[PDB]
Amino acid sequence: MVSKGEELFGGIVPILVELEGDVNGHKFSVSGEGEGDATYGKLTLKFICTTGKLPVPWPTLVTTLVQCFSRYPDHMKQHDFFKSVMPEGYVQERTIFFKDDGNYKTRAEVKFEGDTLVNRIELKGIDFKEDGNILGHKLEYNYISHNVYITADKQKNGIKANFKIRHNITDGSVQLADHYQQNTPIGDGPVILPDNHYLSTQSALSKDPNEKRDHMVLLEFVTAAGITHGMDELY
Ligand code: NA
Ligand code: NA
């Protein structure tokens, strides 16, 4: 039994991302394009700030800017909420608390438009410090690697997640961005309430040497883990 949701992700799927943001009254828009290959947990994306200069560091937007591309091991596929709701999609909401600084609140809708997987986001940030690490651009442009811990959320027919991103500061210190996440279905198909598990996620950030707009190139890999269902007994 291969679900409709799963069969949607068996090959290379084009991705579009559109974000509108306002952090401390600094308004900005970001567009992204690329592709996802869930068979490999692999994402290739390029984002551009279409309004001019981004008023916050690119690294702080990575997690906001499509966990339906995670590779779920075969023995865990029954726990993949993200693909289970496709093509109608899910709402993804977060609060991201920057320690000793402000917070982002984000709301996104992730769904197919024809054969393209789209992430449409609104981001609002408040309470940031004028010359803190975020509005002062004091974060290095680094590899990001952490686990996303997922739990079921029965009363919204969805999931919650939590994780901590540790952004290095330009003085060698660390800016914590503590993430709280909820996802709930847009449609009303079968409800997948996963057992606890995590997504091991690695994002590599680079620049396109021929691109003069403010932008970010991402190569990302995302793999579900943390559940065995007796697989160990096989060996
Ligand atoms: Na981690
Ligand atoms: Na990577």
Curated annotation (Swiss-Prot):
- According to the UniProt record, what happens if one changes residue 165 to V? In P9; increases fluorescence at 475 nm excitation. In R10-3; matures to the red-emitting state with excitation and emission maxima at 555 and 585 nm, respectively
Q: Summarize the impact of residue 201 to H/W/F.
A: Results in significantly red-shifted excitation and emission maxima
The observed outcome of changing residue 173 to G is: In GFPA; leads to enhanced fluorescence at 37 degrees Celsius. In Venus; leads to yellow fluorescence, improved maturation and reduced environmental sensitivity
Q: What is the effect of changing residue 47 to L?
A: In mut3.3; shifts fluorescence lifetime from 3.03 to 1.88 ns. In R10-3; matures to the red-emitting state with excitation and emission maxima at 555 and 585 nm, respectively
Recount the PTM note.
Answer: Contains a chromophore consisting of modified amino acid residues. Maturation of the chromophore requires nothing other than molecular oxygen.
Top-level taxon of origin: Eukaryota
Q: What is the effect of changing residue 67 to M?
A: In Citrinine; leads to excitation and emission peaks of 516 and 529 nm, respectively
Impact when changing residue 78 to R: In Azurite; shifts the excitation and emission spectra to shorter wavelengths and increases quantum yields compared to BFP
Question: What effect is documented for mutating residue 40 to N?
Answer: In EBFP1.2; shifts the excitation and emission spectra to shorter wavelengths and increases quantum yields compared to BFP
- Keywords (A to Z) from UniProt: Chromophore, Luminescence, Photoprotein
Q: Which GO terms describe its biological process?
A: bioluminescence; generation of precursor metabolites and energy
Q: Describe what happens upon changing residue 191 to A.
A: In mut1.5; shifts fluorescence lifetime from 3.03 to 2.72 ns
Q: Does the keyword RNA-binding apply?
A: no
Result of changing residue 220 to G: Suppresses the 399 nm excitation peak, leaving only the longer wavelength peak at 475 nm
Quaternary structure, from the entry: Monomer.
Family designation: Belongs to the GFP family.
> What name does UniProt use for this protein?
Green fluorescent protein
